[model samples]
Target: ESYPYAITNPYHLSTLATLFGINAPEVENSKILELGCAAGGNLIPHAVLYPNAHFVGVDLSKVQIDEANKNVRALGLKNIEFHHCSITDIDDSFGKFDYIICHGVISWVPKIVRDKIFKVCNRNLSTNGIAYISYNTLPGWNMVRTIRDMMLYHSSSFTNIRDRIAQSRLLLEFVKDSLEHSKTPYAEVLKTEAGLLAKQTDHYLRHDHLEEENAQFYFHEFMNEARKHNLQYLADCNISTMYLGNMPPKVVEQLKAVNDIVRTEQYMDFITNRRFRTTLLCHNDLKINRNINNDDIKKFNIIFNVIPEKPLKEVDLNNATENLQFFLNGNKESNLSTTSPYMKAILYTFSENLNNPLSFKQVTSEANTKLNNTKLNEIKNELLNNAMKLVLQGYISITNQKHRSKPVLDKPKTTQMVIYQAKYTPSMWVTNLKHEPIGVNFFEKFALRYMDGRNDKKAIIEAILGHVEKGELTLSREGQKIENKEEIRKELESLFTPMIEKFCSNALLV
Candidate 1:
């Protein structure tokens, strides 16, 4: 099964650079190149979002390239084209791109091919372009490398990919059980590592750990390599990792002992054992401020999906002693006991617009109206500081949204599903209007099959019910099948409203 990687979107790359105060190219209508783009999983979302933009995806696999081309044809996307070619053979004739993305491919290539990947990036990137390159990091990979060594050693006898993967798992399980008697830390580490490996897919094991050229580097070493290619480190696609300010005070102090960025990052890896990095690089001549500023928040849009731990009615901004607990993306929970009322207002407003991205200007305007701000500079600074705090804490996102002001919430007259997703697979993976993936259940997936906007909701529901009667579709109510049409209608109707609302909320309506 082919996995979809939505993280390689140019919108994400551009926004990450913008966060570092680099005026990266606007994603809309910009030319983008994806080196080793398998089946165009990352580039296709951009093509769907920005029809005006041009995309060129190159991969060494003709099968993958052919699949990508077929999907493009199915979607009738005229702006994107896929080529079956090697990155080493990419010449100047391919032209420059506003953004170059190379994900999950570099660390798997040989040294010469890796060097050529950077050379192609340097030669074909626009003056202000940004490049995203993700790789396995050193020190962190040392432990994984150990596991890989064992797996390779054990699976060497198996020639077929399937047999190799099976043997790899068998060896890991045997090793884990074999280490059960030992009380040493290394034994526990091996057990834990083996446990983690057991959860991965055969494909992941084959490509990730089993790949021949799984080269890793220290952060400084990676930067040096980039420098040699006339590219400079901008920021990581993961915004939180770039800042020491996001770390604990003690950790920050420990890291501060290092003077420069490369060294600091290297020491950081040494401390935390960073295994992977999705780093953004730019033309070496383009300078960027290493320090993150609060004022920079105003230059970009803010988006987040956070829920107040307490009820909305519980939040009394006037109460000096009140602490509002907030949960971010369901896992992270933090208590908001700040003095600023703007912070509360901003959080409340964002919660109100959970489905849409709000501009900093819009947020400030809303906060002003709510707080009745008479002091201009005072509230601006407070709001700025509060926003920076939230961003640094990984509670919110600061993005450069390239399309419409907010996400498309209503059903479009001409709705489009992710072309490859709908055509080739029964996967729950489909791109939303915001260019993010949304996972659906079996019924939702069935409903989405008819979400081409050619048929109305009634017709779509009818089509699904027809499938149920024909035994093509199955409906379960608390593990029991419904035999009657009325029950089926009720079940479908129950799912319909919430599904549509969720679809709208997730920007999946389009």
Candidate 2:
């Protein structure tokens, strides 16, 4: 089974601590441990980025461990190690870790193994370390569990995994169509769930729904397990989900009146019907301040995915009272009005650096030249308030650490991109310089096979043409086979430029 790389778990150590006012280890030189780290899909990129850091991953599967070792050897990375051992085998000799990650493992394993995971987290994590664990939650999972039961029963007759998965999807589609004509809420749920399954890979369906062991827990039930191991809940990887500010005002008021974190979160789960959670936890002895404020903004770096509706040149941005419409990652449109010029300038600067991260010091310096010393602190306060407001609106993301930008060009060359991957796997998911995984399509995979950083665009194109002529690769568009020489060359050129550009933009070229 293939697991798409998890992007949230790696980046959380750089952002979650600011939410709880705890000092998390820097991503550059911190020691990391990952339990159930299948094939090193999530940890390898981190090891590549921070060569000074040490990383260790443990799993029960020797096959996955062998594949992970091959990947590490190909990349020539010395900072990461993998072990074919179970969580129950872990002991104090494994040493303490600055960050511990366990994803997609706890809920699928037995009770004894799950308890051992928490025990490992408690005994292995350093004093200031944070541990991230992801699982399927209850109340919301009630409906999903029902779907799972139906699929398991339908696929039970098949002996082969692939055949079982196919039958499961077949049954889901049949049930979905039967309920499509109905307007009831249960029918809607069935239709939606089936539609989601239809979009997933067969591997995901086989591992997720067809598993013999599947477990789900309520919010407080999971937290109580953590408490048994001297661990306490800190925050979620998606910080926005854990905050009450994003909820309805009435709901926020009701939650505030309770003043209990566990009850508040449980009530929130019921209200939102959340099905999955990637929760962060820490040592019980560490005093975590749950309150958040604007002044804390100075403690971290900021990166956002917002773009202004109108060009900056066309708008009269220097004016103190103009309203601007901006889109947040192409999802929602927000109208923001700010009287401070420094705040406006900072927003403009951030819009330009959407791919790169900027620290608080850098942002303040960019906006500082435009402001007088007397109004600097005033502008800082306004900027902080505005940042907090935007974050609460789910428009911006703040990272506790910074990432350097190194974009590639038309003739890109890099020590990254791990050429051995292209030589081995037919379809692969590789991480960008930002540690985000990008899946390569058929054409993209074929294109990557020839990228050795030594070949120019023309040479790579000629090599692909040679492969096509030798019948090693086939050329087709919309299921129409391209036979003409000129047409084949044109199609290859078209795919070549854009794919290289994509690799450059995602920092895959280095």
Candidate 3:
């Protein structure tokens, strides 16, 4: 039941891209299956958001599977199903999935089980469909393994996994603390664990706690195995990371010369010690055609009009492209130029959701595909980043004058918006707009109150008009003569000046 953060699967993105006709960078979705759906935290959000897509989540843990099913029911969501089955035991008739996502399960399972998963996916994958498989990588993990080894040794003294993780974390803290003030050759490594240990909860620490948690393979080994099973490497799931920004221009240029995607990725891996990546693949014999349609772009633009409108300066951020730029940029600043016309189409579709209240679940269902959670995460992050820019920019313009913050709200179904959801939802909604500067009717009521009873000018000006500087009232018949009448008149003049000037007439007062 314990788990870490959401696993990022690239094949899902590919499926999502293909299904949605977002041909910018990957395949689209038509029908999708997620392996190891966990508690359905990620799955439920997707289902709730993308109301039309039909999705099936298969998990070995009946507990997690049931939890996912319950979430589906609670939301009154349609077009999704969950099954309690091991990856190796998924029924052969599971039928075709446009995208099949296997994130952490592949590396965790034994070879025999993994083979069965491959067979199932290979047989059930829709023609030209994509499969995402992720696992532990190499040389890059060397130091990581060293720390893990050290943690394992410290924790092995305990039999319970939870106990082991607690021990490992304690040891890590000791080492981290020691390194902060101690003199040692491995100070940097120890320091790294210090930061790492600080963030470890029991679930995340389990991977470190279990010495035989599972096997960690190099990229080539996993790739070779996938290839043997008839699946070929399409791309790494971290499409944004494959961006040229991380690589030297020469490497990018060299990669440009090579046409084979797998080869280019291999070349990049050879140079950069990238041992960890969510690798996207497809059946070697199958050919997927994803060409972008101009009409799709127009449609996306029209539907995604809700994207926060921002001035130009705010739009230049790193993820601003998640908005309109996702359509404009062919390469969008990365090594992976979105060449697949289908990929482009998919990206464009994903872009539409960024601005509007589109559902992720619906997107997958409509596309009849899944998306690489990694790419979608990146795109979503980028889109939100752009949205933040809009909020920030608007804050500058509306910080005062009847507004505190922009009151911008994210769609209810999205995971990102849920954190701040309760604030804007009708169940707990509160209006920030306040009526100001006492209208003529309000003033007339005040005068009537004064004539009838004893409503004082100080109370009227201070409380009603919010003009505290108008001075206090007296007990005389005149009652301070509504002190500072000229000042109040001048203040009203200043306040209404802009509105009066806007139309070249006092239309607001009139």
Best by TM-score: 1
Pairs clashing within candidate 2: 14-400
User: Whole-model Cα lDDT per candidate?
Assistant: 0.75, 0.76, 0.49
| Model 2: how far residue 21 lies from native, Å | 2.1
- Candidate 1, residues 1-510, lDDT tens digits: the string is 344455666766777777666787878879999999888867776787788899999999999999889878878899999999889889999999999989888988889988998898799999989888999998889889878877887778645778788888888889888998999998897799889999887776883446575778788888888889999877777666756775789878876766577788777788888999988888988778766677878777777776666665665654546666566656354445444566666666666566566777777677666565653455566678777766876667766763244433243222465534654576777776655677777777777777675667677778779888989779888798997998898788788778777665666654
TM-score of 3: 0.55
Q: Residue-wise lDDT of candidate 3 within 1-510, one digit each (tens)?
A: 322223233333543344234332222235777788776654554454445556788888888888777757766777788888777767757788777777777767778887877787688777666677777766566667777777766667755776777787788778876777766767875586567765866776684434554556667677777877888666554444444545678967778777666666666666776757777667777554433232232122112222223332453223423433332212334222233323333444434433222343334333223232334544434333332222222210111111122111211011221211222222221111111111223222222222212333334233424422333222222344444555654443343334223211111110
lDDT for model 1 comes to: 0.75
RMSD, candidate 2, Å: 4.0
TM-score for candidate 1, please give it: 0.88
TM for every model, in the order presented, reads: 0.88, 0.84, 0.55
- Please identify which of the two predictions, 2 or 3, would achieve the higher lDDT against the true structure: 2
